[model samples]
Target: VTSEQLLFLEAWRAVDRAYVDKSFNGQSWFKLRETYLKKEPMDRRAQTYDAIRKLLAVLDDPFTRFLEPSRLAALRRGTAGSVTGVGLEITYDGGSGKDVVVLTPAPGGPAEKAGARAGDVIVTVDGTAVKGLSLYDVSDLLQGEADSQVEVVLHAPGAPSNTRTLQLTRQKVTINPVTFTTCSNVAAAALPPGAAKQQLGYVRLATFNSNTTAAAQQAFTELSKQGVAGLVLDIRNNGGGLFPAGVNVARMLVDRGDLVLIADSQGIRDIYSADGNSIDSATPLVVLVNRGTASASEVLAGALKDSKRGLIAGERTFGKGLIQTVVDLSDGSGVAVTVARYQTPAGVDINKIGVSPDVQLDPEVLPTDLEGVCRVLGSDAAPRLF
Candidate 1:
């Protein structure tokens, strides 16, 4: 086979072996290869890349993607929670006609230091209008070499007259997945009248990376020392990372039980369960999630809810049940193909249908409503206190 044909064949074989659905979502994989190969052979590297992208598009999966060399390099680095940027987690604001919105700034990072808060709409990045750019495009604009600077203009939430321009210095931002505070500190001034003085622990998981499980363990250890009456695990705006990290975090809270079910194209099921080494199985647990909670984050949330281990609050999760495995091609490029589908321990397949919260709270009230939400989870009516 020629070089282009060889590249196409490699990609085709990878997808065939790994795609979650054997039927290729009802499209014939063989037929697709034949049709593409019958056309003019790709004579350039860019043409071959485009062909591979077009082939993956046939699967109609947003999670599965062909990453060029540069993107694949970045993806590899991101697994370690290291990135060169101004440390803001921005996503597409679907309600605002595709404007990019800052979900939150990394704790103690440049964006937070520059006063950029959650719900801030990004107007421009380095003088380039971002009105029609995708979230990924805007993010690419924000990232560059360390010690570089990027200018960002944002429209702060709830204050139309508040437009701010910030020149943020780009640096290597390492995302810390877990941060904790006492419930009293979180709701010191915001607690509603007549609320009980419950000593609760609040743990925010920014994202599931390689360090997530260990970070969570440390946080739980510290909270245990504080004698917290209950705990809240916050996963708001947490776009998930490693899959095993999710299972490991769930294991910390859930006692010995089924954690999740991994199913492949052959319908074979692999059960991942807890190992009787729970960190705080007896503590009352509540999870806070939002629309940005996705991938591995959804796995943890679904497992806790299905096992009756925790009460989930906030909005419905970002349902992304498909699992992707990155396969590096010989030519430095790679493909992240959907290889499996995961279900909750109770066998709930939360694909596009996300995990619904047990106690749904309004998104606008999330920042100020932790006390009330935790209160409800600890009440007598909530799920039996773990």
Candidate 2:
């Protein structure tokens, strides 16, 4: 088979092995693969890529699609935000116990730019041997002022004496998905005839990734220290990322009870419960969402909504309750296939019908009306439109 055909098959094999739907959308997946390999034009790069897209298109699930190299790079960049450090996430390789391995070169980050790949052993940093250093110690050495430089020596994945020295510049990498602010007053229309203003902690979680949970935890802690009376979690444009991160973010605000319910291919359910590692659980919470809120974002919002500890403001969410896993092929191409589906804590499978808000407001506006929300939660029973 030609290399292009092999690339197409690689993506095909990924879906065949792990796709959530056992029926393969009620077609013979193998026969379709045979037709693609034999009948389709797989001679050119564009044709092969087109074949891959067409093959996945048969699945009829929007989340399942082909990822060309550039699109894969862009997805990786969007998954995590920028950090002012060398873009390499390293860990002590437990198998060897002698080498620190590059867990991942933060996609499109400085380390990737410096030719660092996952599984490359970090041998030394600026002449300091990593043999006896802790992972945290190595991390401290790697981070510095942006535009500065750090010397990294890496052993190629398979191993050899051909260790290369890379003069890498420590630069600000991608976007910071987790950010926070304080909203102390209500808008002019938010308050009636001069209602009292309330101080509130505002944490805008743009997206969830490996770095998001800790950043969110710290943001909540900082906001709590600022002594805000309540919290406003703005998850307006969060397109969603890493699922576990979403559950963990919910855990920060919810101390107990069911977080989410997931279903496997055979229709068995697994309930994820909170471990009580909550950050600011007792405070009044307001979760802000829009149609841009989806997937993992729905997970967090759903959990918090069922907990009944907060009010959901803004429009209904984007109704995506399925879970997907992205598998990368050797050629930097990939396929995202649905692995399972999930429901909220309320047992709602909001796949197409999204979560309804408790208090609907102007879709174009944020809930800067802390007093209005607090009064609604306070059970004052005022018949106010707000």
Candidate 3:
């Protein structure tokens, strides 16, 4: 009957109607709601939020969790991947669980050099607490003269309150969600033992975000223009982002086919299909994956595998196939309810069972540079991205 109770019901209703598992973790979902509502009209916002969180826990689904105002802001700008600041892209996930959460640090950028990691929380920036700032504000605070120092305090989620201070150097980091390189020359005078120095294009897809789809399109276009004999696509260590972006990427590779299926408690709700807009469907290509590859990354890999557009190489994926739709509540807070589960083009449920690479490669065998890429994925090619 109060604003807090209204917020609680908003979340409960979202899950009651849409959660993939209708069993509600085998509890009387309704009774639980009634029981909690009576206890609600909590004295404080935090108390009500905590109660909502506990109610969600009954479902036993971690993704179905509460999003406080700060965390919700983080989710909103989760795709702010392109930036110029000490190499760390961040958002306010409660202020860093009450401060600044790092999305990811640019490769070889100062953040990386200073050991800033994804999922790390920022406590203070240049001695000022980052608690009340937006992601853009925190980023601006982290920015200064190129190569200037910005001291940051960070801590890991599991490490809890064990924050450490780092003197970070600022730089303009245009995070390349899709990175492209080519073995334009493989020391070809000797024919290099493989494909006679066939000028292979290598693309390293880092993360799937708003920036990824276009970046990938450009990468494929660039490689196609060069007329590379074959291509190598590397997607190692990429934790995906942006569901629509992943589907769009799949369309770029798959000329035609059912790409992904979205399902909820109501049954299959929708299907994403390709419309013959592939960059080069007939091109020889190979995709590299590993345990770090997940979510939207799995979507892209699954579509490619089921459609037969490309060959997947390396270890199995991270297997996070469930999709959660973050619903904004009346208050500034929100709820990320697991509304649906996505199936591959072939209709395989890769929830806890990640996408299996068509060809398996060991850990050390995974390569980064052109020569090493030429060695491992001679005929191979390659996110919810950064």
Candidate 4:
């Protein structure tokens, strides 16, 4: 057998042994291996990668994927809470010519300092046009060694005629997963004219990462010091990170008990429980979620809602209950295989079906809805609002 055969065999055996869904989405797993393994393609490495991807795609699980070397490295760096770039979060705008759009700029980072704003359409990078480039390709163009300069041209929102070129220095941007602000402080800027202020503590969880629990604990401690009446955890755009981080966040609000149930392919379940050292278990809590909240974010929100520890408010969550275990290959590439599935404390399986909000609200009116929820949480009529 050639090196390609070995690579394909290695991935095939791994998935067959560990994939949580034994049904293999109604496809014959062995037949798939046999069909792909016999193909003698020109480039062995590329063929192997493509074969593995094709094999995984048959599983019908979106979360399970094959990561090439560069993407795997990026994933490692992102999980470590650092990325070398101009500090702009972007997404594809889905237009024929305009492709990349700025989602947001990191606070006080190079992009913001260079006058990049959300809703700006990125036109070119370093004088290279990006009309037909994918988001991944454009993102690669934005990243380089620290102190290296990258020029970006953007069409500002509401000013299509105005295009500005900004020179930004790439640096190692550290992502802080948690941030806290008092409702009074937000009201000063975000609220409408003469809107009544609610004395609620706002904790915006950007993502569940290694540093997330510590950051959340510190925020909660500070909020407790302010004597805030209630707490609101905002996970609106949080796509989630490390699984243990989500469990830790959930443990912060719930008392000692099973937090999640992880089941393998054979239906054997392992229960993960909290240590009973809840920081602010008694505090009235509300979780803010939306279509962007997913994976580990859903885990934390589901745990809170199922345990009756917090009320969920917003749109239905981005359901992603599959447990992806990243297996690093010898060639520096890796595979994120769905090895198991998890359930909430109440045994609710929120996979394709998302967790519903206790108080459903439109995404456009999230701030006002949050204010209303906070007011109810702070009042004696809180329990009845849900």
lDDT of each: 0.75, 0.73, 0.72, 0.72
lDDT score of residue 304 within candidate 4: 88
**RMSDs, each prediction?**
5.7, 15.4, 7.1, 7.0
Candidate 1 regions off by >4 Å?
78-83, 88-105, 108-139, 147-169, 183-197, 225-227, 363-386
Give lDDT: candidate 1, residue 277.
75
Which whole-number lDDT from 0 to 100 does residue 257 have in model 3? 81
RMSD of 3: 7.1
lDDT of 1 by residue, 318-345 (tens): 6667777888898888888888888887
lDDT per residue as tens, model 2, 313-346: 7778767677778899888977888888778777
lDDT of model number 1: 0.75
lDDT of 1 at 312: 85
Candidate 2 all-Cα RMSD: 15.4
Best model number under lDDT:
1
Candidate 4 per-residue C-alpha lDDT over 162-220 given as tens digits, one digit per residue, 9 for 90 to 100:
89989998887666788777655333322323334445677888767778989998988
- Can you rank all candidates by TM-score, best first? 1, 3, 4, 2
User: Which wins on TM-score, candidate 2 or candidate 4?
Assistant: 4
| Candidate 3 residue-wise lDDT at 340 | 83
